[PDB]
Amino acid sequence: APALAEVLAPTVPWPLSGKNPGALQGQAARLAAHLAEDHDLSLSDLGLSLATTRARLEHRAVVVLGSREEALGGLGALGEQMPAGNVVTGAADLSGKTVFVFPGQGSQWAGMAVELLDSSPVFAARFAEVAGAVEAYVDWSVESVVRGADEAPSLDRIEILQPVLFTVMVSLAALWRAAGVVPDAVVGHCQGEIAAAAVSGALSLGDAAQVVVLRSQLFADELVGKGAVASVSLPAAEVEARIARFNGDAELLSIAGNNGPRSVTVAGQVAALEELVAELEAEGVRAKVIGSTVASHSAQVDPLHERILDLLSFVQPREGSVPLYSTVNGEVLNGAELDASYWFENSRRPVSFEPVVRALFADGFDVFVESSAHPVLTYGISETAEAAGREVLAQGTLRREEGGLARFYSSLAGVWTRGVDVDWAGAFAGRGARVVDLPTYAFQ
Amino acid sequence: APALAEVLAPTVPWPLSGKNPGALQGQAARLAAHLAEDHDLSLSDLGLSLATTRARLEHRAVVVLGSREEALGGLGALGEQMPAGNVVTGAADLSGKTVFVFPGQGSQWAGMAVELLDSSPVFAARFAEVAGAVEAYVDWSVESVVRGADEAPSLDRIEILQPVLFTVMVSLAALWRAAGVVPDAVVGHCQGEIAAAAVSGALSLGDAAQVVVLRSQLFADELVGKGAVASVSLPAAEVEARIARFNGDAELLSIAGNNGPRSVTVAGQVAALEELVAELEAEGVRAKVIGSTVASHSAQVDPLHERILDLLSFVQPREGSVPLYSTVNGEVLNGAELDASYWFENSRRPVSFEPVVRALFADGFDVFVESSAHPVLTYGISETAEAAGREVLAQGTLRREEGGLARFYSSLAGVWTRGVDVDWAGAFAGRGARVVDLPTYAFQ
Amino acid sequence: MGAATPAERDAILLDLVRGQVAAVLGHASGEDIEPGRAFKNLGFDSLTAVELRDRLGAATGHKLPATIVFDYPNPTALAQHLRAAV
Ligand SMILES: *C1=CC(=O)N(CCCCN2C(=O)C=C(SCCNC(=O)CCNC(=O)[C@H](O)C(C)(C)COP(*)(=O)O)C2=O)C1=O
Ligand SMILES: *C1=CC(=O)N(CCCCN2C(=O)C=CC2=O)C1=O
Numbered sequence: 021a022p023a024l025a026e027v028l029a030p031t032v033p034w035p036l037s038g039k040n041p042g043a044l045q046g047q048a049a050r051l052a053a054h055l056a057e058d059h060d061l062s063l064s065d066l067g068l069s070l071a072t073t074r075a076r077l078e079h080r081a082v083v084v085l086g087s088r089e090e091a092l093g094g095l096g097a098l099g100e101q102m103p104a105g106n107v108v109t110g111a112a113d114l115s116g117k118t119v120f121v122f123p124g125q126g127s128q129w130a131g132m133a134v135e136l137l138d139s140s141p142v143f144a145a146r147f148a149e150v151a152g153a154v155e156a157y158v159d160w161s162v163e164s165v166v167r168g169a170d171e172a173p174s175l176d177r178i179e180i181l182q183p184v185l186f187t188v189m190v191s192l193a194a195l196w197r198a199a200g201v202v203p204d205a206v207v208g209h210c211q212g213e214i215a216a217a218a219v220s221g222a223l224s225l226g227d228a229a230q231v232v233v234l235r236s237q238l239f240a241d242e243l244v245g246k247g248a249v250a251s252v253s254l255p256a257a258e259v260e261a262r263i264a265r266f267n268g269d270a271e272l273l274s275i276a277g278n279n280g281p282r283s284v285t286v287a288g289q290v291a292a293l294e295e296l297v298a299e300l301e302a303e304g305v306r307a308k309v310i311g312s313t314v315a316s317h318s319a320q321v322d323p324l325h326e327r328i329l330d331l332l333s334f335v336q337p338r339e340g341s342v343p344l345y346s347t348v349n350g351e352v353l354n355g356a357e358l359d360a361s362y363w364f365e366n367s368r369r370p371v372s373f374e375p376v377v378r379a380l381f382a383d384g385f386d387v388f389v390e391s392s393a394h395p396v397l398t399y400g401i402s403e404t405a406e407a408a409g410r411e412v413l414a415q416g417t418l419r420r421e422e423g424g425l426a427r428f429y430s431s432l433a434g435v436w437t438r439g440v441d442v443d444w445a446g447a448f449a450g451r452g453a454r455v456v457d458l459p460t461y462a463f464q
Numbered sequence: 465a466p467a468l469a470e471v472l473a474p475t476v477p478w479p480l481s482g483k484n485p486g487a488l489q490g491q492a493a494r495l496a497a498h499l500a501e502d503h504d505l506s507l508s509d510l511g512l513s514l515a516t517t518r519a520r521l522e523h524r525a526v527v528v529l530g531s532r533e534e535a536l537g538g539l540g541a542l543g544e545q546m547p548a549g550n551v552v553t554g555a556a557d558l559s560g561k562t563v564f565v566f567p568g569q570g571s572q573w574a575g576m577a578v579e580l581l582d583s584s585p586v587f588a589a590r591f592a593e594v595a596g597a598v599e600a601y602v603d604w605s606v607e608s609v610v611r612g613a614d615e616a617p618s619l620d621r622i623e624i625l626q627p628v629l630f631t632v633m634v635s636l637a638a639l640w641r642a643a644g645v646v647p648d649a650v651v652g653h654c655q656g657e658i659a660a661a662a663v664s665g666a667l668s669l670g671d672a673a674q675v676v677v678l679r680s681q682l683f684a685d686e687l688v689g690k691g692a693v694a695s696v697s698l699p700a701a702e703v704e705a706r707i708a709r710f711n712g713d714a715e716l717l718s719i720a721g722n723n724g725p726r727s728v729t730v731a732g733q734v735a736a737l738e739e740l741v742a743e744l745e746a747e748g749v750r751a752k753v754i755g756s757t758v759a760s761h762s763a764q765v766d767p768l769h770e771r772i773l774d775l776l777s778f779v780q781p782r783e784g785s786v787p788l789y790s791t792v793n794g795e796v797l798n799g800a801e802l803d804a805s806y807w808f809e810n811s812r813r814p815v816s817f818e819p820v821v822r823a824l825f826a827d828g829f830d831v832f833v834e835s836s837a838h839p840v841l842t843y844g845i846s847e848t849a850e851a852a853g854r855e856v857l858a859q860g861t862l863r864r865e866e867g868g869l870a871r872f873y874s875s876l877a878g879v880w881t882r883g884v885d886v887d888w889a890g891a892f893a894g895r896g897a898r899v900v901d902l903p904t905y906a907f908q
Numbered sequence: 909m910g911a912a913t914p915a916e917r918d919a920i921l922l923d924l925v926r927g928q929v930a931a932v933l934g935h936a937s938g939e940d941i942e943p944g945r946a947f948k949n950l951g952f953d954s955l956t957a958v959e960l961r962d963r964l965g966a967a968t969g970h971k972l973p974a975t976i977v978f979d980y981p982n983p984t985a986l987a988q989h990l991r992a993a994v
Contacts, residue, residue: 072827
């Protein structure tokens with residue numbers, strides 16, 4: 021029922037496709053002249069007409085426009101083989117087998133989700149549903165946090181951050197689904213698996229919400245101050261060797277995430293971690309301690325085992341609608357095995373991301389949609405793809421300071437232009453747009 | 465959330481695909497060798513595994529199977545490039561822009577939707593919802609009629625058939641939608657436009673139900689006996705010429721529909737119509753009186769104009785989710801213009817099917833799903849593609865005496881092997897299928 | 909650019925970095941970017957920094973540090989470092 025776009029949202033997308041690049045330029049120039057000549061044309065009529073009455077062809081370009089002059093700018097640049105900030109182009113050369121990627125922390129920024137609360141009814145609807153479910157288990161308001169009201173808790177607090185990023189990531193998924201982009205599989209990084217399970221339907225919304233709320237609250241109580249996570253731009257095995265120096269006679273530092281060929285996360289007590297980061301900042305290596313992070317995925321969580329199994333005894337896992345590529349046990353779960361023990365293992369075992377990306381590649385997944393507010397895993401996935409000679413698209417949803425329909429439609433165009441089927445017609449729903457006559461070029 | 469298939473239902477589909485026909489038949493023969501070695505392998509595990517873990521490639525097959533025997537049979541055949549009844553093959557060379565076709569009478573057969581009520585929860589749930597809307601306006605049960613219950617009225621009567629065909633068509637649309645195949649547009653033939661408007665949301669179920677019930681009851685009261693419609697396999701022009709022989713003084717016969725370059729419907733008084741059909745058979749021309757028809761799409765509905773306007777004054781047409789290509793006016797409609805007067809024009813105007821099939825080719829539609837119990841319009845469409853030089857798929861849903869998951873998955877495969885994206889994983893819902901290792905044929 | 913003066917080198921590398929930044933920004937003018945303006949002010953997150961580095965690596969046919977954009981804040985500074993790099 022809820023639409024991609026508020027009926028008064030000025031942003032709309034114009035999808036175009038030709039046989040070859042010259043046909044795409046010619047139709048764009050014709051379309052520009054069609055618009056220039058008639059000041060009375062509805063941008064929604066033309067959009068609906070492009071999205072409904074045009075052949076789907078290999079060479080693709082989407083113009084994201086909120087006005088005539090943004091449409092003439094886009095179609096002008098398109099027409100003279102020139103780039104532009106609001107034109108996304110590509111060849112439909114991918115199979116479009118899609119995996120939705122739910123990271124943990126690092127996606128967050130102040131203002132995330134706001135522009136879409138005000139401008140996307142689908143996003144708003146899903147955000148209300150999911151927020152509604154988390155607010156059974158907390159006293160604060162998810163919308164109020166996201167909108168940055170005076171009274172609202174701080175995102176610096178792991179126990180506010182996790183439930184919020186969960187709402188945002190799960191709500192972004194439903195916006196893709198309304199655009200016609202459904203996952204054929206789902207992957208999650210630590211707390212991202214809680215979102216993937218909600219999006220897969222393996223956990224009820226209510227059960228998923230309660231897990232991220234109770235586990236992040238348990239970490240705020242037991243683990244804040246006693247340890248953190250650091251990111252290091254070395255292969256994991258190289259970092260394992262360096263870690264051995266510290267934590268000689270006990271696990272003070274442990275690998276927390278094999279994220280990439282040259283990207284690993286380490287967890288443990290703050291001092292050992294800061295010593296490791298400085299020793300490595302010396303030898304040119306990109307290593308930093310992530311803020312608002314506890315030393316999960318380490319021995320520090322072993323003592324909370326009995327408390328976590330009781331806290332999450334309520335979870336009734338069930339078979340989901342798509343497979344979850346576990347980054348805990350490296351299996352292809354159907355979701356019915358995501359009980360209390362899984363959610364302990366999810367918070368204890370080092371995140372095995374790098375190998376499930378390779379496994380996904382081999383299984384023929386060639387489109388990676390990160391259902392997040394800023395891309396934390398997509399560049400890693402691209403770097404892995406090129407090191408392996410694979411053609412994939414790793415596509416983020418929103419970015420820092422770009423969190424509205426213009427950004428969504430650009431990300432939606434990233435995936436359409438590379439051969440994912442998209443319901444562009446849905447951009448115009450509820451507007452009473454009509455199909456109108458379009459210039460034909462070399463065809464139609 | 466209703467499921468394609470009952471857990472207990474033996475029928476599952478196995479999708480395969482290869483870079484080329486030889487790899488496809490190579491992969492088939494390798495997979496049959498795997499299945500033959502181990503009697504312990506779950507057909508549902510291998511099903512879900514084939515749906516999820518294998519690249520999506522140009523050259524495609526689906527094995528429809530309720531047993532190890534039918535699996536090895538399919539795969540042995542596929543491996544020896546030999547046709548089998550339970551194997552659909554094709555190359556994914558269509559864009560898969562899909563238009564849903566809704567015919568009128570001709571698709572009915574005894575027990576048409578019984579296997580799907582008994583074994584597809586999604587089809588059963590949608591059949592209950594649509595029937596319930598119809599049963600607000602009649603004293604009989606659509607289920608009872610379809611099942612052949614003793615007390616149930618006869619399908620021979622136009623006023624039972626139309627609403628039953630309405631129920632079956634709209635329900636079949638929802639079965640496709642559950643397998644991940646949704647219309648990019650809808651077309652209908654006479655009454656089939658009502659099913660089209662129901663599926664597109666242009667009419668409410670309640671409105672659409674009441675239109676088909678009341679109009680079919682009107683024609684039963686005013687028109688039965690006074691005329692009928694026949695199919696003739698000649699061009700419109702040559703049928704106009706043949707018609708003129710009977711149309712000496714008062715006109716007894718006229719073109720009711722243009723359906724195909726050599727496919728045409730004629731309406732008029734029964735004696736004239738039988739005489740026309742009888743003299744055509746003598747020559748070797750395919751022609752039949754269609755069973756339970758009246759001389760709709762003719763001057764005989766002219767005196768019903770006022771009564772139809774009064775009878776269908778309740779309708780509240782609205783913008784639907786997909787455009788409706790009107791056979792009556794040859795316009796692309798959002799569904800808000802389907803008022804009483806339109807439903808009169810739908811019952812009076814000769815049906816331009818063939819011209820709007822041409823308009824749909826030209827707007828890039830290369831897949832035509834007929835949401836029907838037996839193909840009536842797919843042959844016309846194909847012949848229309850041949851004459852306009854277009855590569856299209858024209859794909860029925862069910863056939864006479866084949867009305868279960870084996871025929872639906874065989875129609876779903878027909879659409880998939882030509883390059884419509886389908887949600888194969890959905891066929892394994894409820895079964896606790898688990899992804900398993902599959903023999904690799906080539907680099908993965 | 910061996911048959912080119914130092915000032916000519918400065919100018920070609922400055923035209924390269926400004927063109928590549930404009931492509932990442934999407935303006936695509938290639939002269940819109942101000943040589944003095946810092947990347948932060950232009951609208952640069954960490955992701956835009958590594959995209960600029962990828963494009964400059966491609967164009968110069970060299971492998972550059974991921975932090976090179978951060979380390980040399982303005983186009984002029986990055987151009988000047990690239991004289992040392994190539
Ligand atoms: C999940 C596990 C865990 O420990 N959590 C606590 C929060 C940390 C979550 N994090 C990290 O921050 C580290 C990883 S993955 C991201 C690391 N990068 C790569 O994969 C390598 C290549 N990419 C990049 O260098 C950066 O993406 C860019 C510089 C290109 C982007 O720049 P800006 O956006 O900074 C992880 O999982 C959990 O909650
Ligand atoms: C609506 C108009 C009409 O003619 N009929 C259905 C009978 C015609 C069935 N058809 C075709 O549509 C073409 C071939 C054929 O047999 C109504 O119900």
